[PDB]
Design a protein around this motif. Sequence first.
Motif, PDB file in Angstrom:
ATOM      1  N   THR A 149       0.844  -1.176   0.000  1.00 32.32           N
ATOM      2  CA  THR A 149       0.000   0.000   0.000  1.00 32.32           C
ATOM      3  C   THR A 149       0.896   1.249   0.000  1.00 32.32           C
ATOM      4  N   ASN A 150       0.605   2.176  -0.899  1.00 30.46           N
ATOM      5  CA  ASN A 150       1.394   3.388  -1.001  1.00 30.46           C
ATOM      6  C   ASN A 150       2.872   3.093  -1.220  1.00 30.46           C
ATOM      7  N   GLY A 151       3.181   1.963  -1.860  1.00 27.14           N
ATOM      8  CA  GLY A 151       4.547   1.595  -2.188  1.00 27.14           C
ATOM      9  C   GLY A 151       4.913   1.951  -3.612  1.00 27.14           C
ATOM     10  N   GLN A 152       5.688   1.032  -4.196  1.00 30.48           N
ATOM     11  CA  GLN A 152       6.194   1.282  -5.547  1.00 30.48           C
ATOM     12  C   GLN A 152       5.857   0.095  -6.444  1.00 30.48           C
ATOM     13  N   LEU A 153       5.805   0.357  -7.742  1.00 29.53           N
ATOM     14  CA  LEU A 153       5.636  -0.761  -8.666  1.00 29.53           C
ATOM     15  C   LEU A 153       6.703  -1.816  -8.517  1.00 29.53           C
ATOM     16  N   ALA A 154       6.290  -3.069  -8.776  1.00 30.47           N
ATOM     17  CA  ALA A 154       7.269  -4.144  -8.849  1.00 30.47           C
ATOM     18  C   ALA A 154       8.160  -3.983 -10.081  1.00 30.47           C
ATOM     19  N   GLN A 155       9.411  -4.437 -10.032  1.00 30.18           N
ATOM     20  CA  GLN A 155      10.202  -4.484 -11.250  1.00 30.18           C
ATOM     21  C   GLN A 155       9.840  -5.682 -12.133  1.00 30.18           C
ATOM     22  N   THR A 156       9.595  -6.802 -11.465  1.00 31.36           N
ATOM     23  CA  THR A 156       9.312  -8.044 -12.185  1.00 31.36           C
ATOM     24  C   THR A 156       7.875  -8.478 -11.933  1.00 31.36           C
ATOM     25  N   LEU A 157       7.275  -9.103 -12.938  1.00 27.71           N
ATOM     26  CA  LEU A 157       5.876  -9.484 -12.820  1.00 27.71           C
ATOM     27  C   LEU A 157       5.670 -10.366 -11.596  1.00 27.71           C
ATOM     28  N   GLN A 158       4.641  -9.990 -10.818  1.00 29.76           N
ATOM     29  CA  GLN A 158       4.316 -10.715  -9.614  1.00 29.76           C
ATOM     30  C   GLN A 158       3.011 -11.491  -9.773  1.00 29.76           C
ATOM     31  N   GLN A 159       2.921 -12.533  -8.963  1.00 32.82           N
ATOM     32  CA  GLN A 159       1.673 -13.270  -8.856  1.00 32.82           C
ATOM     33  C   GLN A 159       1.353 -13.456  -7.379  1.00 32.82           C
ATOM     34  N   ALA A 160       0.071 -13.466  -7.071  1.00 31.81           N
ATOM     35  CA  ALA A 160      -0.324 -13.845  -5.707  1.00 31.81           C
ATOM     36  C   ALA A 160      -1.583 -14.692  -5.765  1.00 31.81           C
ATOM     37  N   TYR A 161      -1.635 -15.660  -4.872  1.00 31.56           N
ATOM     38  CA  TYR A 161      -2.739 -16.615  -4.786  1.00 31.56           C
ATOM     39  C   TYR A 161      -3.882 -15.980  -4.019  1.00 31.56           C
ATOM     40  N   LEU A 162      -4.996 -15.727  -4.694  1.00 31.49           N
ATOM     41  CA  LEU A 162      -6.154 -15.074  -4.074  1.00 31.49           C
ATOM     42  C   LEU A 162      -7.412 -15.886  -4.362  1.00 31.49           C
ATOM     43  N   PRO A 163      -7.968 -16.554  -3.369  1.00 30.50           N
ATOM     44  CA  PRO A 163      -9.174 -17.350  -3.616  1.00 30.50           C
ATOM     45  C   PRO A 163     -10.384 -16.435  -3.674  1.00 30.50           C
ATOM     46  N   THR A 164     -11.358 -16.887  -4.466  1.00 28.03           N
ATOM     47  CA  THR A 164     -12.547 -16.054  -4.621  1.00 28.03           C
ATOM     48  C   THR A 164     -13.373 -15.996  -3.347  1.00 28.03           C
ATOM     49  N   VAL A 165     -14.094 -14.897  -3.244  1.00 27.56           N
ATOM     50  CA  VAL A 165     -15.076 -14.638  -2.206  1.00 27.56           C
ATOM     51  C   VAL A 165     -16.387 -14.371  -2.921  1.00 27.56           C
ATOM     52  N   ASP A 166     -17.356 -15.259  -2.717  1.00 32.32           N
ATOM     53  CA  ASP A 166     -18.551 -15.198  -3.532  1.00 32.32           C
ATOM     54  C   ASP A 166     -19.389 -13.971  -3.217  1.00 32.32           C
ATOM     55  N   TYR A 167     -20.364 -13.703  -4.088  1.00 35.11           N
ATOM     56  CA  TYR A 167     -21.161 -12.487  -3.966  1.00 35.11           C
ATOM     57  C   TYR A 167     -21.824 -12.364  -2.597  1.00 35.11           C
ATOM     58  N   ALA A 168     -22.394 -13.461  -2.104  1.00 34.84           N
ATOM     59  CA  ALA A 168     -23.089 -13.378  -0.818  1.00 34.84           C
ATOM     60  C   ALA A 168     -22.198 -12.897   0.320  1.00 34.84           C
ATOM     61  N   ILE A 169     -20.958 -13.375   0.337  1.00 33.89           N
ATOM     62  CA  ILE A 169     -20.020 -12.960   1.380  1.00 33.89           C
ATOM     63  C   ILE A 169     -19.424 -11.623   1.040  1.00 33.89           C
ATOM     64  N   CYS A 170     -19.014 -11.482  -0.222  1.00 37.34           N
ATOM     65  CA  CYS A 170     -18.356 -10.233  -0.560  1.00 37.34           C
ATOM     66  C   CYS A 170     -19.262  -9.025  -0.399  1.00 37.34           C
TER      67      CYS A 170
END
Length: 240
Positions: free
Chosen positions: A137-158
């Motif tokens: 947050t409020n940091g800088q762009l990555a130099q190299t492409l990043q990935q992160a594992y983010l599981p979905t949160v369905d509509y009812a919960i989200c």
Amino acid sequence: VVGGTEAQRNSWPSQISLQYRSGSSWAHTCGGTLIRQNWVMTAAHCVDRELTFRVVVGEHNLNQNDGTEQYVGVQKIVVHPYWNTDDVAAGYDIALLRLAQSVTLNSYVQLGVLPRAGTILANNSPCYITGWGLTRTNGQLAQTLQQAYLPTVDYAICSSSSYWGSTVKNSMVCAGGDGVRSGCQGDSGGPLHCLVNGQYAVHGVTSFVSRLGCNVTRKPTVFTRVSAYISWINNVIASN
Ligand SMILES: [Br-]
Ligand SMILES: [Br-]
Ligand SMILES: [Br-]
Ligand SMILES: [Br-]
Ligand SMILES: [Br-]
Ligand SMILES: [Br-]
Ligand SMILES: [Br-]
Ligand SMILES: [Br-]
Ligand SMILES: [Br-]
Ligand SMILES: [Br-]
Ligand SMILES: [Br-]
Ligand SMILES: [Br-]
Ligand SMILES: [Br-]
Ligand SMILES: [Br-]
Ligand SMILES: [Br-]
Ligand SMILES: [Br-]
Ligand SMILES: [Br-]
Ligand SMILES: [Br-]
Ligand SMILES: [Br-]
Ligand SMILES: [Br-]
Ligand SMILES: [Br-]
Ligand SMILES: [Br-]
Ligand SMILES: [Br-]
Ligand SMILES: [Br-]
Ligand SMILES: [Br-]
Ligand SMILES: [Br-]
Ligand SMILES: [Br-]
Ligand SMILES: [Br-]
Ligand SMILES: [Br-]
Ligand SMILES: [Br-]
Ligand SMILES: [Br-]
Ligand SMILES: [Br-]
Ligand code: NA
Ligand SMILES: [Xe]
């Protein structure tokens, strides 16, 4: 991407960098997904400013020569006609970019596969976000492409009070929200890749995070749901 790991160079070959001209240089501003050799899918909010944009395919390190890049100008921009920049919560955060040239495909440059229309993932389906966005947050762009594992949160919960409440629509996908890993600014426009019957498809276009911060518990990253826009995408490509 906050709490990501560096993607392997050939893991996500439909990922593009959307860049704007700034002086004699170029600056990354958003991600995108190559969906035809001359068409990119991104977020409408990424092209709200009327800048000169170029797309880089085969990009891995924004700061170094990878030896695989193709640099192509953006020739035409078709933003979803219902998009309203001052109402991102209403959705429609999607745009198509026709490239000046058709790019050449190889292990670093491939078309993104899109989900079947109307497909909705079960809660907690595994996905990866990818991007060069801020690594804090409020940091800088990555130099190299990043990935992160983010599981979905369905509509009812989200859309529940503890989460995003009424801000989230069924035309969006929520993913993440563990307080550690998230999309962040500069990831906008890029893909959320999720497995379906053994193959990744691009289910999401990164749209927004909390004003509170990128990695905020129960403020999962929010994406435009690609499978709500299959007909729209096909219609634009067919007329253009
Ligand atoms: Br990909
Ligand atoms: Br300028
Ligand atoms: Br540059
Ligand atoms: Br840059
Ligand atoms: Br094609
Ligand atoms: Br083509
Ligand atoms: Br590198
Ligand atoms: Br650097
Ligand atoms: Br470079
Ligand atoms: Br060009
Ligand atoms: Br245009
Ligand atoms: Br437009
Ligand atoms: Br080709
Ligand atoms: Br290949
Ligand atoms: Br390879
Ligand atoms: Br699908
Ligand atoms: Br379909
Ligand atoms: Br739908
Ligand atoms: Br979904
Ligand atoms: Br990095
Ligand atoms: Br709740
Ligand atoms: Br709303
Ligand atoms: Br909706
Ligand atoms: Br919907
Ligand atoms: Br952004
Ligand atoms: Br940014
Ligand atoms: Br399966
Ligand atoms: Br699977
Ligand atoms: Br919480
Ligand atoms: Br559709
Ligand atoms: Br269609
Ligand atoms: Br239609
Ligand atoms: Na590079
Ligand atoms: Xe974002």
